[PDB]
Design a protein around this ligand. Structure first.
Ligand SMILES: NS(=O)(=O)CCNC(=O)/C(Cc1ccc(O)c(Br)c1)=N/O
Ligand SMILES: NS(=O)(=O)CCNC(=O)/C(Cc1ccc(O)c(Br)c1)=N/O
Ligand code: NA
Ligand SMILES: [Zn+2]
Length: 258
């Protein structure tokens, strides 16, 4: 559809094409750290990315996305709130026009410069399409970016963005190691939610890491040179491609840590 992030087609309009936008399990949310409860029943979280096979990087007009070979269990997420095995299929980012906005989730109303989403599907459903329609079909590992020191493991991403400036452009992006995007700690919050983009399916278990990664000003500036538009269309910078916090409704956010 013709959805985006501007005044005329942004988050406040999405519900007309996607009525679930006003649903009971929408994402992102504000994470009230004082209301979230430590849950001793959460099993250890396992991020097993050694065997990841990145493939290409694409500007799809909404973000940039790195896809992975998810034809076998290579790079997988298990444990924590999850039952079974979830296979990494892609990552992408959301970011702002200024260093003080850009994240989708917020922490005690704090907005970060950007947010990384590592998207995984439950292998019990066989493919990512079928999984996208199940209430336990998807798991997104969310990681905040704050501006400070450079993140070396982000630099290869940063350096290819020039080659995918406009919507529809892709490039090779093999041999990228997503472990380089993680913070030290795997402490997290978890809640049941949705895709934060149309079609807004209520099929995601969210796992949001507490520790942000630090990226440099120069790194995030390069995100902001991307374009929402296609080649030889007029320039609209790809910035502020984030959905704001949605009503929590009757959900509980659980913490993995005391
Ligand atoms: N390796 S890939 O080709 O990038 C994988 C593409 N699929 C995915 O990201 C997903 C989640 C998803 C993303 C956007 C959507 O609109 C819907 Br619905 C589901 N699969 O469920
Ligand atoms: N934000 S999310 O809840 O983690 C998962 C939903 N969003 C995304 O995957 C993306 C990249 C993307 C956008 C449209 C697509 O058709 C496909 Br495929 C991937 N957002 O820009
Ligand atoms: Na960090
Ligand atoms: Zn996302």
């Amino acid at each position: 559809h013709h959805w985006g992030y501007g005044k005329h087609n942004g988050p406040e309009h999405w519900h007309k094409d996607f009525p679930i936008a006003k649903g009971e399990r929408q994402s992102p949310v504000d994470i009230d750290t004082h209301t979230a409860k430590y849950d001793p029943s959460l099993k250890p979280l396992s991020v097993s990315y050694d065997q990841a096979t990145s493939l290409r990087i694409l500007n799809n007009g909404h973000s940039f996305k790195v896809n992975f070979d998810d034809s076998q269990d290579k790079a997988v997420l298990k444990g924590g709130p999850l039952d079974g095995t979830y296979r990494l299929t892609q990552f992408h980012f959301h970011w702002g026009s200024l260093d003080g906005q850009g994240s989708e989730h917020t922490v005690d109303k704090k907005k970060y410069a950007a947010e990384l989403h590592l998207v995984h599907w439950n292998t019990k459903y066989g493919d990512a399409s079928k999984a996208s329609q199940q209430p336990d079909g998807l798991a997104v590992l969310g990681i905040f970016l704050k501006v400070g020191s450079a993140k070396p493991g982000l630099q290869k991403v940063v350096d290819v963005l020039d080659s995918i400036k406009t919507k529809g452009k892709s490039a090779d992006f093999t041999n990228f190691d997503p472990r380089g995007l993680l913070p030290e700690s795997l402490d997290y919050w978890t809640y049941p939610g949705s895709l934060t983009t149309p079609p807004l399916n209520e099929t995601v278990t969210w796992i949001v890491l507490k520790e942000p990664i630090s990226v440099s000003s120069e790194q995030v500036l390069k995100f902001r040179k991307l374009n929402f538009n296609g080649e030889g269309e007029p320039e609209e910078l790809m910035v502020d491609n984030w959905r704001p916090a949605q009503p929590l409704k009757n959900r509980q956010i659980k913490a993995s840590f005391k």
